[PDB]
């Protein structure tokens, strides 16, 4: 079937869409070349649509079915709790899209009788109507990036009403939170923190006689998801012990929402139909991981690859296996791609076999190596800093809802670039404006979290470990990448930053409390006359488990 059908109606913006970085004093400090940073707008909607509209090709075989059973077996062990309207309401973000029925996120969290009575009807409806397609909205996602030697057309997000969204939580939250792990096990990426992802990646890499690995970029994964897939996915969920209403709920959401449905724009006009994955639903991340894993696993067997270990995060896939030689591997990978193509998951960038782990890129990042105070190697997780910086600049000169810099600092706290640039910049700013003690919302694996800036040192140590404050001697590969990015964007050089940080540090010492703590641990690198860094008392009082349990991108989740 066609992934998308269009009536001709336009994908419209429900306000004003900014596209260029403002020339501001605070931002021009971080990076000068503002004319290299852009935000996607609905103006490029049509272009995306062309790229994401086509006819799927899907042929299944024994390997696929054999793997689907292996997976269903493990799912059977699961028992998923049915959330109550009240619990589901807790999970709704405060910034979540308002309903088309007289209420928004705020009311939902407050349990407003109106918001709640409506949610009930939507539920009662799901249990009664097992066929009527459910409406969804189609918008142009606004994201910021850096120009490439054209530009990236905005991504399109499809999502149902807030009422429907709260019900999805009731029936499938516990499911999409425990099942993917019970099925894929150590291969489920969202269960790991940055430290753990690295551990798993080098531990897997070193467990092979002669390792070979590759990342696999599926071309617009969401559009390749077929009605067949969405149902196979449902069969897996159906293996869970479920409460009657939940089972009926899943059956209906599958047919009415997940496999497809009408598309309405912000103006109420009909846009077309969707016969693929809905990026903005609760089951997106879970289902994409399950589908990707299923196919890739089956593809490995079809391709005769040896001892394949998968690490899947949604549609993001990386594979480490036993090398059979340069020619044998290149032939096998090629077969793998063909098998994946028949499973309706064609490549965008033909997969290239890598023999140097640091060269493999999964979830837009890679495993690199640095050294602790003792000079002992300390493997860690990094990534090109171009996008994080473009967004950083952007977020500085524009009030953004989800500060992605806070998050980027947490996730990449031990990297060269996050420590030298991000930590420095944002703090001297927070301090200058005296915002050191303000809770800010940021994201981690799709879920929205409220974070207090000064609690960073604990968080960092608890997630990464003290070594994150003393790492040095980053590989030459890493340096050259941070070098080019900074050059390209017109970012101040190392010497400039050290001086700035050299100042922010002392700026922080003279205040004590958690503040002086930050200056002491975060900017240790700054001074040559260091300071022995010991375990932070408050580090052991942080329950960051919920932070790394499952994926929720587009799932509209908010962990209180
Ligand atoms: O800025 C540089 N080059 C440039 C700048 C502008 C235009 N074109 C090129 C530039 C110039 C020379 C070296 C360099 O890399 C660096 C910078 C600091 C380094 C290392 C390499 C290292 O191997 N080992 C330790 N440190 C010290 C260090 C650290 F352990 C942690 C930090 F939190 C900050 C910091 F200092 C850079 C880099 F892109 F910043 F990364
Ligand atoms: Mg965990
Ligand atoms: Mg892709």
UniProtKB/Swiss-Prot annotation:
Mutation effect (residue 363 to R): In strain: Isolate pCV-J4L2S
Cofactor notes: Binds 2 magnesium ion that constitute a dinuclear catalytic metal center.
Topology of the protein relative to the lipid bilayer: Single-pass type IV membrane protein
Catalytically driven reaction(s): RNA(n) + a ribonucleoside 5'-triphosphate = RNA(n+1) + diphosphate
Species whose genome carries this gene: Hepatitis C virus genotype 1b (strain HC-J4)
Post-translational modification note: The N-terminus is phosphorylated by host PRK2/PKN2.
Protein's UniProt name: RNA-directed RNA polymerase
SUBUNIT field: Homooligomer. Interacts with non-structural protein 5A. Interacts with host VAPB. Interacts with host PRK2/PKN2. Interacts with host HNRNPA1 and SEPT6; these interactions facilitate viral replication. Part of the replication complex composed of NS2, NS3, NS4A, NS4B, NS5A and the RNA-directed RNA polymerase.
